[PDB]
Design an enzyme around this catalytic site. Structure first.
Site, PDB file in Angstrom:
ATOM      1  N   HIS A  83      30.934  42.848 -14.029  1.00  0.00           N
ATOM      2  CA  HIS A  83      30.555  42.104 -15.222  1.00  0.00           C
ATOM      3  C   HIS A  83      29.108  42.437 -15.571  1.00  0.00           C
ATOM      4  O   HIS A  83      28.240  42.443 -14.692  1.00  0.00           O
ATOM      5  CB  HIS A  83      30.748  40.606 -14.913  1.00  0.00           C
ATOM      6  CG  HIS A  83      30.631  39.674 -16.080  1.00  0.00           C
ATOM      7  ND1 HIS A  83      29.511  39.607 -16.880  1.00  0.00           N
ATOM      8  CD2 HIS A  83      31.462  38.692 -16.516  1.00  0.00           C
ATOM      9  CE1 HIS A  83      29.677  38.663 -17.792  1.00  0.00           C
ATOM     10  NE2 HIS A  83      30.843  38.077 -17.582  1.00  0.00           N
TER      11      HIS A  83
ATOM     12  N   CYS B 213      34.266  34.419 -21.349  1.00  0.00           N
ATOM     13  CA  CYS B 213      34.598  35.809 -21.647  1.00  0.00           C
ATOM     14  C   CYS B 213      35.648  36.345 -20.671  1.00  0.00           C
ATOM     15  O   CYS B 213      36.632  36.975 -21.086  1.00  0.00           O
ATOM     16  CB  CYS B 213      33.334  36.683 -21.633  1.00  0.00           C
ATOM     17  SG  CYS B 213      32.192  36.501 -20.173  1.00  0.00           S
TER      18      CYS B 213
HETATM   19  N1  LIG Z   1      26.731  36.383 -22.808  1.00  0.00           N
HETATM   20  C1  LIG Z   1      28.035  36.468 -22.592  1.00  0.00           C
HETATM   21  O1  LIG Z   1      28.563  37.491 -22.142  1.00  0.00           O
HETATM   22  C2  LIG Z   1      28.862  35.217 -22.730  1.00  0.00           C
HETATM   23  C3  LIG Z   1      30.233  35.379 -22.906  1.00  0.00           C
HETATM   24  C4  LIG Z   1      31.035  34.278 -23.141  1.00  0.00           C
HETATM   25  C5  LIG Z   1      30.468  33.028 -23.176  1.00  0.00           C
HETATM   26  N2  LIG Z   1      29.139  32.886 -23.000  1.00  0.00           N
HETATM   27  C6  LIG Z   1      28.544  31.466 -22.992  1.00  0.00           C
HETATM   28  O2  LIG Z   1      27.922  31.229 -24.233  1.00  0.00           O
HETATM   29  C7  LIG Z   1      26.767  30.379 -24.040  1.00  0.00           C
HETATM   30  C8  LIG Z   1      25.536  31.106 -24.509  1.00  0.00           C
HETATM   31  O3  LIG Z   1      25.427  32.358 -23.788  1.00  0.00           O
HETATM   32  P1  LIG Z   1      24.428  33.480 -24.306  1.00  0.00           P
HETATM   33  O4  LIG Z   1      24.694  34.748 -23.584  1.00  0.00           O
HETATM   34  O5  LIG Z   1      24.490  33.432 -25.784  1.00  0.00           O
HETATM   35  O6  LIG Z   1      23.004  32.901 -23.857  1.00  0.00           O
HETATM   36  P2  LIG Z   1      21.601  33.000 -24.611  1.00  0.00           P
HETATM   37  O7  LIG Z   1      20.496  32.716 -23.651  1.00  0.00           O
HETATM   38  O8  LIG Z   1      21.470  34.388 -25.226  1.00  0.00           O
HETATM   39  O9  LIG Z   1      21.753  31.968 -25.826  1.00  0.00           O
HETATM   40  C9  LIG Z   1      21.439  30.565 -25.706  1.00  0.00           C
HETATM   41  C10 LIG Z   1      20.534  30.228 -26.861  1.00  0.00           C
HETATM   42  O10 LIG Z   1      20.389  28.793 -26.974  1.00  0.00           O
HETATM   43  C11 LIG Z   1      19.029  28.480 -27.193  1.00  0.00           C
HETATM   44  N3  LIG Z   1      18.793  27.130 -26.685  1.00  0.00           N
HETATM   45  C12 LIG Z   1      18.614  26.763 -25.381  1.00  0.00           C
HETATM   46  N4  LIG Z   1      18.538  25.461 -25.201  1.00  0.00           N
HETATM   47  C13 LIG Z   1      18.668  24.949 -26.472  1.00  0.00           C
HETATM   48  C14 LIG Z   1      18.676  23.620 -26.976  1.00  0.00           C
HETATM   49  N5  LIG Z   1      18.511  22.540 -26.209  1.00  0.00           N
HETATM   50  N6  LIG Z   1      18.829  23.446 -28.305  1.00  0.00           N
HETATM   51  C15 LIG Z   1      18.957  24.528 -29.085  1.00  0.00           C
HETATM   52  N7  LIG Z   1      18.965  25.820 -28.733  1.00  0.00           N
HETATM   53  C16 LIG Z   1      18.820  25.959 -27.417  1.00  0.00           C
HETATM   54  C17 LIG Z   1      18.242  29.572 -26.479  1.00  0.00           C
HETATM   55  O11 LIG Z   1      16.973  29.706 -27.107  1.00  0.00           O
HETATM   56  C18 LIG Z   1      19.124  30.809 -26.744  1.00  0.00           C
HETATM   57  O12 LIG Z   1      18.785  31.514 -27.935  1.00  0.00           O
HETATM   58  C19 LIG Z   1      26.775  30.006 -22.554  1.00  0.00           C
HETATM   59  O13 LIG Z   1      27.532  28.811 -22.404  1.00  0.00           O
HETATM   60  C20 LIG Z   1      27.495  31.203 -21.920  1.00  0.00           C
HETATM   61  O14 LIG Z   1      28.145  30.919 -20.686  1.00  0.00           O
HETATM   62  C21 LIG Z   1      28.332  33.943 -22.797  1.00  0.00           C
END
Ligand SMILES: NC(=O)c1ccc[n+]([C@@H]2O[C@H](COP(=O)([O-])OP(=O)(O)OC[C@H]3O[C@@H](n4cnc5c(N)ncnc54)[C@H](O)[C@@H]3O)[C@@H](O)[C@H]2O)c1
Ligand SMILES: NC(=O)c1ccc[n+]([C@@H]2O[C@H](COP(=O)([O-])OP(=O)(O)OC[C@H]3O[C@@H](n4cnc5c(N)ncnc54)[C@H](O)[C@@H]3O)[C@@H](O)[C@H]2O)c1
Lengths: 331, 331
Positions: free
Chosen positions: A178, A151
């Site tokens: 952030h 992000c």
């Molecule tokens: N939240 C933000 O602001 C943001 C912004 C940009 C990028 N990201 C990236 O996106 C990714 C997800 O972030 P997020 O905020 O959505 O986190 P999150 O915790 O909300 O989502 C991750 C999801 O994956 C699921 N999960 C975990 N292990 C798993 C597995 N082995 N198999 C299947 N499902 C599984 C979890 O249950 C959860 O619902 C990360 O790499 C993060 O760095 C996040």
């Protein structure tokens, strides 16, 4: 018309799902997480930051129905067990946070998916890494794994692109303030990052940012010139970047701002109003430039240029990732 | 023993009062605000961030009693109507936020107090401005009006002093990520600063910092070398400063940290643990140096030094101000 599976139906995965409902050439046919389908359907419908999804959402067995669309719901912790070949998956969106390495993301290829887009920086510098409308045309049809960066990278990269093309960056620093994310803790609890361990809604939390290692991959000529970190703070979503750089040329404040206005696009908004973080919640821009904050520190002929951009670390990133997926459809 | 009055029994005024209860050469004999004494007594007793004052607190007419001590309570909006001559006030602590100009603070002199300490930067650049354990010995008997600067200035000043004396500062920038204060709005409401107008507990809010104008007055050799701003964020109290500067000498990270540690005192803490903002709530240190975060951005021989210090914008500043008051009691 490409078939998409979402691995990790979390904050990023669900918002990407919501946004893909209105993209004509892209159908999500499967999602995977670690819970029952009814839980995912409820979290899809109701969203604390981004409001209710006003569609009829039903679940029958492992089938999520959105009005007339049918989506297979899996709960497979090992992505190599996912039935991607059977469902002819064109692109997996890898948004678990748990498979950001080349080997990890490629488990989807072994499962039968043709291409993987990681919703985060890759672990290795060799993976194609893009910010839409900065360098996404560097994608090759031979790229099996693609990183959509972070992000903060999607926020920072247009600013660095404009400064590099127009004035030349010598060096500088960036800092993102952030919103807290699901990688932090609600109450003080174990975490290998001893500050991310701490109650996230009552703490300023210094930690790493992915923009530090991803920016040089998105704007190659800026490689090695910038570093910085993140201060996570208690807002649900919404963030800001401060970039302070020495430039080769010596533009005025007005010229810097005009150079940013000229790069405006669907990904890069030119803002002129005195806004705060909540004003970017649910934005579809990857970056929102705050032209009122631009200033120069001038000491004995030395100039330090300071520029600011906002981003909804959820929505801004999500619509950038969606723009990458649509572009891969034409590949 | 000196007699003190506190004008403005707010966040700063009440914590100053609390701290002065344990200083035997300083007696607070009067306080002033815009409300009933019962309201002031209750707010002195119960404090959302710093806990309960565990003394017997009573009000009888306009007399506030704390165990054996009697304190007069006034409600005069115009400080020139306060009876400072009658009560033989040596020092007024001006902590309303409404009399930071030389003419405004001097109303306490006209009313009969011998000396005024403003709990904020003064409007004029000519007012004696001090950070305790940086330049407080510059106070002279001619200084009837003294500024104890701002909370961010008290955090930043020791870092600028140590860098300036050991390595020489060329130029740089500072950013403070800062707890919200009573000058912000709980709900979106009118404010001359259109960002401070916005709901403070849900927003990142870019605004000014008093350290941008106060730092040149406290470390004179650094005058004109720094500029910066503040991002107010939703924590009740607790803040951090990031300082990014170019230096003449080229010390290592270890030598920068060692120079900070050498300057440690009751005003300046050398910290080696990975803390977050809640760990500095109620601290008596004016500034808390985070040695683990010190780093250098090195680009083809160009160096940008980055250093970090925490402060409880309330308690840290309060205890710095009380140290100024004790020093004034000797002279
Ligand atoms: N939240 C933000 O602001 C943001 C912004 C940009 C990028 N990201 C990236 O996106 C990714 C997800 O972030 P997020 O905020 O959505 O986190 P999150 O915790 O909300 O989502 C991750 C999801 O994956 C699921 N999960 C975990 N292990 C798993 C597995 N082995 N198999 C299947 N499902 C599984 C979890 O249950 C959860 O619902 C990360 O790499 C993060 O760095 C996040
Ligand atoms: N809050 C902080 O973090 C902080 C830190 C350092 C310095 N300061 C400075 O200290 C000052 C006080 O700030 P604060 O946070 O205590 O604010 P505050 O709002 O808590 O306190 C101000 C008090 O003054 C009273 N008051 C207002 N106008 C008055 C008048 N004309 N006569 C008498 N009483 C009056 C108010 O009722 C209130 O109790 C400001 O100048 C502020 O910039 C604040």
């Amino acid at each position: 018309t490409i078939k998409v599976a979402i691995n990790g139906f979390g904050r990023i995965g669900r918002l990407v799902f919501r946004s893909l409902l209105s993209k004509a050439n892209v159908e999500v046919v499967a999602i995977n997480d670690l819970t029952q389908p009814e839980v995912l359907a409820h979290l899809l419908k109701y969203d604390s930051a981004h409001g209710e999804l006003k569609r009829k959402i039903t679940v029958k067995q492992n089938i999520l129905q959105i009005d007339r669309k049918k989506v297979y719901v899996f709960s497979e912790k090992d992505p190599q067990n996912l039935p991607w070949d059977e469902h002819d998956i064109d692109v997996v969106i890898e948004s678990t946070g748990r498979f950001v390495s080349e080997e990890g993301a490629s488990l989807h290829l072994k499962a039968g998916a043709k291409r993987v887009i990681i919703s985060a920086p890759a672990k290795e510098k060799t993976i194609r890494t893009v910010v839409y409308n900065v360098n996404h045309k560097t994608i090759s049809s031979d790229d099996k794994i693609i990183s959509a960066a972070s992000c903060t990278t999607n926020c920072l990269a247009p600013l660095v692109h404009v400064l590099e093309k127009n004035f030349g960056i010598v060096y500088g620093t960036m800092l993102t303030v952030h919103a807290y994310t699901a990688d932090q803790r609600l109450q003080d609890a174990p975490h290998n990052d001893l500050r991310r361990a701490r109650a996230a809604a009552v703490n300023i939390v210094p930690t790493t940012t992915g923009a530090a290692k991803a920016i040089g991959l998105v704007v190659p000529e800026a490689n090695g010139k910038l570093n910085g970190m993140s201060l996570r703070v208690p807002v649900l979503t919404g963030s800001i970047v401060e970039l302070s750089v020495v430039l080769e040329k010596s533009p005025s404040v007005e010229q810097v701002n005009q150079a940013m206005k000229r790069f405006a696009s669907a990904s890069f908004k030119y803002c002129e109003d005195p806004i705060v973080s909540s004003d970017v919640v649910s934005s579809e821009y990857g970056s929102i430039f705050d032209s009122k904050l631009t200033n120069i520190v001038e000491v004995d002929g030395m100039k330090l240029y300071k520029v600011y951009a906002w981003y909804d670390n959820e929505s801004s990133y999500v619509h950038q990732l969606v723009r990458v997926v649509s572009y891969c459809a034409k590949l």
